[PDB]
């Protein structure tokens, strides 16, 4: 399953 | 910005036998950026309903796609793949050879 | 056996034509098992391998929401990175993401991965310690300071050591022979006269999984490295792979040549000849 969203760069 | 020229191979899923259902593949790989145009040609004419794999990439970030269609090879029918990409000054056409 | 899980994201801006396109694919080893495309009619995570179809609706729902949120996050990242590099707001740019876990036979984490490329160039990467970043340039150092303050590495580490490992173990249990048992190549040698004095021998490997393979031509049991034409390994379209190796030989000397095939699916390395 995918990772929960990152902070933006 | 990085620009990498696509590698192209055109080939059948199974060894060709005239009159037997098969898949015609055009594998484009090693390219950047991802914008690319790939057509499968039968006797010079664009084949419709050609499907492709989901956009993926290699460890060096270069993209790859498989374009494919179901087809029945014959003696006379000529197949090819036509690729357009920002790195190519003209479209690249690679002919299907059943021995490669 | 040892195994890996990987997710691959591609975001491509198109200023003036709407929000960037976001595509994700997931792999276990060399098998693609999911996709998401932000330009689909009703974007959702979709199965691409039979063994993932058994996951319940809560799985597909959670993942779909993640991809939709990540697409918006990548759109913000692309805005920030054209700012960092002082680039035109009219042009199309690419943000790629690649993450996942390598496990050994016991299913324990060997190595975690979380890394990014901007316009095809490495930008920032989580180090092997899963605690620190390597930035390619002063732009990527802006991202690094942001992610250090936000404790991003701890979020990545928790996933890589936890969900990544646990879900890869699950997919291996449910994929069984499709993922754990290598499929050996079907092999044959073909012969193509060029002239009265030269012929091509071509060694074929078809229908093999995983993609890793070695094909070598030998003359009297010595590798013909400098004289072998080797095509890049290519997908058949049915989850298996193909490769061939060819040598041009003098007519009547074909008996001196053998093709050597090494693949995980073979009981032992194969020696083939024209027959
Ligand atoms: Na072009």
Numbering used by the authors:
A (entry chain E): 1 to 9
B (entry chain B): 0 to 99
C (entry chain A): 1 to 275
Task: List passages from the publication reporting this PDB structure.
Here we describe a mechanism by which an HLA-B*0702-specific acute myeloid leukemia phosphoneoantigen, pMLL747–755 (EPR(pS)PSHSM), is recognized by a cognate T cell receptor named TCR27, a candidate for cancer immunotherapy.
To exclude the influence of different crystallization conditions on protein conformation, we generated fully isomorphous (having the same space group and very similar unit cell parameters) complexes between HLA-B*0702 and the following peptides: MLL747–755, pMLL747–755, DOT1L998–1006, pDOT1L998–1006, E7P-MLL747–755 and OSE-MLL747–755. Substitution of phosphate with phosphonate (E7P-MLL747–755) or sulfate (OSE-MLL747–755) sharply weakened the pMHC-TCR27 interaction (KD = 47 μM and KD > 200 μM, respectively). It is notable that among the phosphomimetics, the phosphonate analog E7P-MLL747–755 induced the highest T cell activation and supported the highest affinity between pMHC and TCR27 with KD = 47 μM (as compared to KD = 1.9 μM for pMLL747–755). Moreover, the phosphonate chemical structure is the most similar to that of phosphate, differing only by the replacement of the methylene group (E7P-MLL747–755) with a bridging oxygen Oγ (pMLL747–755). In conclusion, replacement of serine P4 with phosphoserine but not with phosphomimetics leads to unique conformational changes at the ligand-HLA interface.
